Amino acid sequence: SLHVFLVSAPGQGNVTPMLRLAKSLASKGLLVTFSTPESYGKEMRKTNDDISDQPILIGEGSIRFEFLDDEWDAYATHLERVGKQNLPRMFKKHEEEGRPISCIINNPFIPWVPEVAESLGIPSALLWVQSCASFSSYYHFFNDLVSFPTESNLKKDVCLPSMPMLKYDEVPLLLYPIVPLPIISLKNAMLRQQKNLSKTFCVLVDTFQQLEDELIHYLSKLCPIRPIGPLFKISDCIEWLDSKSPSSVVYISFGSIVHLKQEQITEIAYALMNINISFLWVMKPPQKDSYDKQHVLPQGFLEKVGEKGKVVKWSPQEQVLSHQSLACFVTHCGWNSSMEALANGIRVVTLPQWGDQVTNAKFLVDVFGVGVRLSRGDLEDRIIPREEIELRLLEVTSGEKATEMKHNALRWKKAAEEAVAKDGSSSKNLQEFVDELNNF
Numbered sequence: 001s002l003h004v005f006l007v008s009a010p011g012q013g014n015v016t017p018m019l020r021l022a023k024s025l026a027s028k029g030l031l032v033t034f035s036t037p038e039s040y041g042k043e044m045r046k047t048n049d050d051i052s053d054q055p056i057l058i059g060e061g062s063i064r065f066e067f068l069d070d071e072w073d074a075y076a077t078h079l080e081r082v083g084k085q086n087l088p089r090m091f092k093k094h095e096e097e098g099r100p101i102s103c104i105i106n107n108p109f110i111p112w113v114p115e116v117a118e119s120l121g122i123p124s125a126l127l128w129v130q131s132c133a134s135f136s137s138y139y140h141f142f143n144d145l146v147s148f149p150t151e152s153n154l155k156k157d158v159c160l161p162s163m164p165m166l167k168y169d170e171v172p173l174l175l176y177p178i179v180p181l182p183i184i185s186l187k188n189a190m191l192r193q194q195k196n197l198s199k200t201f202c203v204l205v206d207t208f209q210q211l212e213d214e215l216i217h218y219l220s221k222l223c224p225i226r227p228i229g230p231l232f233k234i235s236d237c238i239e240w241l242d243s244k245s246p247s248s249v250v251y252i253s254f255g256s257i258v259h260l261k262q263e264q265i266t267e268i269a270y271a272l273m274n275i276n277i278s279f280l281w282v283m284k285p286p287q288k289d290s291y292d293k294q295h296v297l298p299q300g301f302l303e304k305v306g307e308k309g310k311v312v313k314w315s316p317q318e319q320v321l322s323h324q325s326l327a328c329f330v331t332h333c334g335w336n337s338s339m340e341a342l343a344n345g346i347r348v349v350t351l352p353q354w355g356d357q358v359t360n361a362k363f364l365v366d367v368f369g370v371g372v373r374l375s376r377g378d379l380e381d382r383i384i385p386r387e388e389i390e391l392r393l394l395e396v397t398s399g400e401k402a403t404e405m406k407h408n409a410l411r412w413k414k415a416a417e418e419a420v421a422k423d424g425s426s427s428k429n430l431q432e433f434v435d436e437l438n439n440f
């Protein structure tokens, strides 16, 4: 019935939640138009045959794919410029066909979208694609409410409300003073998103109330949040895994962006060879425009390790992480992977790299209690050697608190599944958002 337009920044980290939310809304019986820049839509339309220029009927609703014309930080202003003109182009064609948009939902890395929305008098909504503690970090940074590291004091602790104390290198690294050249682009977009929050009536977050309970209430009277996660639940690999014994495979994957250093890759392989543990390891091939090059393994690696180890280029990570044969998840602690691990009951080994990964790894290890810390990310600037890698793999699988960390994980999978059930907090939140879309 209701035409709700969704628009994502390019990239797995942003498209996966927007699309997951799109499927949620369509299931709730709405016309949902997902939109992403064409240069990126090109790459998911080649790999997908059901991204097929018809609505995919979901529940009582449907999902049409109207990619914004990319005409393609130099890119950031280009996407803004092109987009601020071509977006209303799409809201005229749509309106003048009897189906006009009643809400635009964007993610932070296109923070100008709310402006365009309010320019046309369309209500603007924000899908936050990180944790509520990541939101709270940015909100308090932008509004200058709590003290943060400065060039004058690069190592300052930070005390945010209803959060553990974070060390200088546990707050999302986009807020760190020492920021490389391109990293400034995303920094401003996050801060630009904090600015336009005034122009937004609802902030949706892929978290569940039990996971970040006290922070969500604190923000409910400051900058209210709507937890509607885990979105992925609300909305050769397997057979090989089907042939292992339960709780025995080390699964390793660092998402679609992180490309570790060769030296770091080598210490992981020797680590896995040494302790002779079963593993599934995603080693992402690079972009064919070099930039950074394909990794290599030790010689005879695959043949020394044998049936115990398996290297793939990409993985059905949702299917993998629900698999009883997994023992742990060496993760870069992206939020989409952190939520997948939490809602599947998987213990983690944290190797965060940049952005909010350091925060999420702080929480998984010290707050959520579901894993072991392996590294501290980019400000640490240290090749984690094979011996501590072997060390954390034994702590998380057979150490003293291994079963305790397992129990913790199970209870978070229990609590994640309550929230997504028909009457749970997140299902209710999501319906009350649908309840508010209609009423206005």
Ligand SMILES: O=c1ccn([C@@H]2O[C@H](COP(=O)(O)OP(=O)(O)O[C@H]3O[C@H](CO)[C@@H](O)[C@H](O)[C@H]3O)[C@@H](O)[C@H]2O)c(=O)[nH]1
Pocket: 012, 013, 014, 016, 129, 130, 253, 254, 255, 256, 257, 258, 282, 313, 314, 315, 316, 317, 318, 333, 334, 335, 336, 337, 338, 340, 354, 355, 356, 357
């Ligand atoms: O082999 C793989 C590896 C990953 N995934 C999927 O890829 C996504 C990974 O997302 P995430 O865990 O969020 O990793 P990144 O792509 O690095 O996410 C980026 O965007 C997120 C939202 O801004 C931030 O939390 C991260 O810091 C940023 O790196 C998840 O849906 C995984 O299931 C696969 O299907 N197969």
